[PDB]
């Protein structure tokens, strides 16, 4: 039942949430690490619940804080959608022990503790994978916890600090000490916190929730090994100077911290030239399909292959492809397409697949085991079946050896299965390796004729010619943008090239062994390339004993671009 409401205020993070990055002792040294932390002076949602959408996202990790003293808060739940369709975490605190479970429980709109039952938390557990029991963690005070999940490993750090009567988060420092690690290894996008109410009875609670980011931190250990101060590396340029110089004091002078560049924003698409469209209507529906032993082959190039209109040409069910996807055929671009249309038996429809053997395969039609393409088969019982029985269709039956991939046999003769020569007469041990298909409208599903069209695509080895109508949106003329050109990945600010690339020229090499003019195949336009604006950053500041004010100087760039 819905009986709880919640309000959200907001506050600053000040400087909190620094946990011992590694369980290693040091002394009187400064250590620089890179890990997940709470960036300083960040955004905090002060939640106040009173008796609601407890769907709080999890992101990468969570920092939780509370100041209640009645032990009203208990346990946590983690998951991605929190239904019975997926697993979820069941870390529940208790005055005696602590229990963690992973199963596809069914949580209601607001799980809670009856208080000592969890039926309202979840109806049942069906397919469970992990269980664990241990000693409980929770034992005028401020209680801080940090939970994270890295490489399928769930780690919790905690700290209980004493606080005076202060309204907001106190200043100073307080390290977090590790407590727990477990191997769960699931995706978790959000989390919920459980409350226990006696019976119900009115209650109130308040807490702070924050999210963490991967940053580089610097920490100062004292002579006993307890962290007393830390410095962020991405807060303000002075902090960057402190991180680079590796000290807590900066003297008067000028220092160099890092560089700056203009980031790319978009991407540029340059397809092959387009003038015409592929004639798909003359292959799938022509009132004629060649025999299986002598199959037709049509070459398709220099046109746009609209596979979407294929469904409107033949009454088939769906595509089946091996090296490509039916829905992704409008993006990939191929230099050549091959169409092979024929008629086979209903039970022989399953006989077209890599790594298969049959009478049709090794004697009529063979494809490489590395086939990259699609096959479309549809029944044609209303056109290739006659009351008297169709006789035009023939298929080979006897052959001396198996057919190689993409090989056809049309030559006819009298097959010999005896020592004596056939001598052109089909007598003893002399047969005809060509049998006519028996098609009738009264036959079964597996014996009805089926029209099969095989489309084979050639990968990007030659200049591409066949793919969908992708617009070559010109990359404006003054944008720091990346570009993908037929396998070449690059970036820069790119204008129109005034260079006179003679019709054969497609790429321009600079003095420094790199491209400075590129070519779009869609329209014969050559494009000029220059590097994106970039430079260095320096900091001018007096000694730290005087003031923290600094000045930032960008090298070689006027105040016109960032």
């Amino acid at each position: 039942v819905n009986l709880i409401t919640r309000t959200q205020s907001y506050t600053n993070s000040f400087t909190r949430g620094v946990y011992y990055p590694d369980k290693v002792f040091r002394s009187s040294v400064l250590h620089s690490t890179q890990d997940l932390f709470l960036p300083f002076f960040s955004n905090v949602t002060w939640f106040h619940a009173i008796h609601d959408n407890p769907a709080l996202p999890f992101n990468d990790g969570v920092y939780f804080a509370s100041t209640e003293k009645s032990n009203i808060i208990r346990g946590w739940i983690f998951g991605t959608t929190l239904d019975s369709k997926t697993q979820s975490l069941l870390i529940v605190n208790n005055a005696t022990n602590v229990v963690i479970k992973v199963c596809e429980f069914q949580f209601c709109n607001d799980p809670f503790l009856d208080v000592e039952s969890e039926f309202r938390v979840y109806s049942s557990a069906n397919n469970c994978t992990f269980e664990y029991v241990s000693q409980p963690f929770l034992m005028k005070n401020l209680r801080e916890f940090v939970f994270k999940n890295i490489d399928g490993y769930f780690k919790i750090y905690s700290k209980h600090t004493p606080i005076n009567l202060e309204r907001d988060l106190p200043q100073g420092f307080s390290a977090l000490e590790p407590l727990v690690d477990l191997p769960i290894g699931i995706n978790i996008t959000r989390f919920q916190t459980l409350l226990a109410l006696h019976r119900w009875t009115a209650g109130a609670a308040a807490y702070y929730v924050g999210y963490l980011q991967p940053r580089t931190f610097l920490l100062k250990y004292n002579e006993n090994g307890t962290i007393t101060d830390a410095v962020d590396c991405a807060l303000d340029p002075l902090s960057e100077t402190k991180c680079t110089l590796k000290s807590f004091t900066v003297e008067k002078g000028i220092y160099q911290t890092s560089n700056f560049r203009v980031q790319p924003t978009e991407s540029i698409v340059r397809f092959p030239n387009i003038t015409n469209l592929c004639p798909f209507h003359e292959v799938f529906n022509a009132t004629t399909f060649a025999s299986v032993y002598a199959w037709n082959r049509k070459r398709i190039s220099n046109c746009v292959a609209d596979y979407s209109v294929i469904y409107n040409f033949a009454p088939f069910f769906a595509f089946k492809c091996y090296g490509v996807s039916p829905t992704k055929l409008n993006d990939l671009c191929f230099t050549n397409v091959y169409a092979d249309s024929f008629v086979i038996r209903g039970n022989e429809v399953s006989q077209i697949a890599p790594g298969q053997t049959g009478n049709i395969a090794d004697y009529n039609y063979k494809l490489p085991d590395d086939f990259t393409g699609c096959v479309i088969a549809w029944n044609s019982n209303k056109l290739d079946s006659k009351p008297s029985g169709n006789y035009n269709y023939l298929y080979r039956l006897f052959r001396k050896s198996k057919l190689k991939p993409f090989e056809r046999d049309i030559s006819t003769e009298i097959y010999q299965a005896g020592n004596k020569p056939c001598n052109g007469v089909a007598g003893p041990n002399c047969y005809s390796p060509l049998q006519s298909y028996g098609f009738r409208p009264t036959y079964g599903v597996g014996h009805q004729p089926y029209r099969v069209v095989v489309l084979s695509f050639e990968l990007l080895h030659a200049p591409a010619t066949v793919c969908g109508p992708k617009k070559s949106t010109n990359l404006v003329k003054n944008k720091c943008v990346n570009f993908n050109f037929n396998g070449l990945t690059g970036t820069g600010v790119l204008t129109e090239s005034n260079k006179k690339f003679l019709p054969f020229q497609q790429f321009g090499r600079d003095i420094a062994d790199t491209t400075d003019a590129v070519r779009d195949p869609q329209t014969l336009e050559i494009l000029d390339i220059t590097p994106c604006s970039f430079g260095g950053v320096s900091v001018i500041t007096p000694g730290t004993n005087t003031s923290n004010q600094v000045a930032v100087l960008y090298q070689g760039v006027n105040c016109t671009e960032v």
């Epitope: 004629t288 025999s291 002598a294 006789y391 035009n392 023939l394 006819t412 005809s432 060509l434």
Partner: nanobody, 129 residues
Framework: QVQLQESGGGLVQPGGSLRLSCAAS????????IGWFRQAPGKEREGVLC????????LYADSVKGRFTISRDKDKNTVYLQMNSLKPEDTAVYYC??????????????????????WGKGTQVTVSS
């Protein structure tokens, strides 16, 4: 696939000459017996000429023996019919047809008459008389 289309014809004086040819496109049968047929308005259609596919064994009709010359070319898969000494009784709608050979008693014998698998649109041959 298998489609038969004819060419030639028209109106000619008695004793003239004509050439009629029907082209067989898409044919795939190994052995078959194609035949030519004519039908004057008011009479039943009947076979005219037919030759063997393997070697070209000439078979002619009594009424049109000698006057009707037939030739089969495998290069274009078409049958050429030559007409001469035309008579008023030759006025009919001429058709071309294709059918397979009869396989009875472990032998190869070409059979025409009725029971033809495919037929063409046909042409009209008229004698001025």
């Amino acid at each position: 696939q298998v489609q038969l289309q004819e060419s030639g014809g028209g109106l000619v004086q008695p004793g003239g000459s004509l050439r009629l040819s029907c082209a067989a496109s898409g044919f795939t049968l190994d052995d078959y017996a194609i035949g030519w047929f004519r039908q004057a308005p008011g009479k039943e259609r009947e076979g005219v000429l037919c030759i063997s596919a393997s070697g070209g064994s000439t078979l002619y009709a009594d009424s049109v023996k000698g006057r009707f010359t037939i030739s089969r070319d495998k290069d274009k898969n078409t049958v050429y019919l030559q007409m001469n000494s035309l008579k008023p009784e030759d006025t009919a709608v001429y058709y071309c047809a294709a059918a397979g050979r009869l396989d009875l008693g472990s032998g190869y014998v070409c059979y025409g008459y009725y029971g033809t698998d495919y037929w063409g649109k046909g042409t009209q041959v008229t004698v001025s008389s």
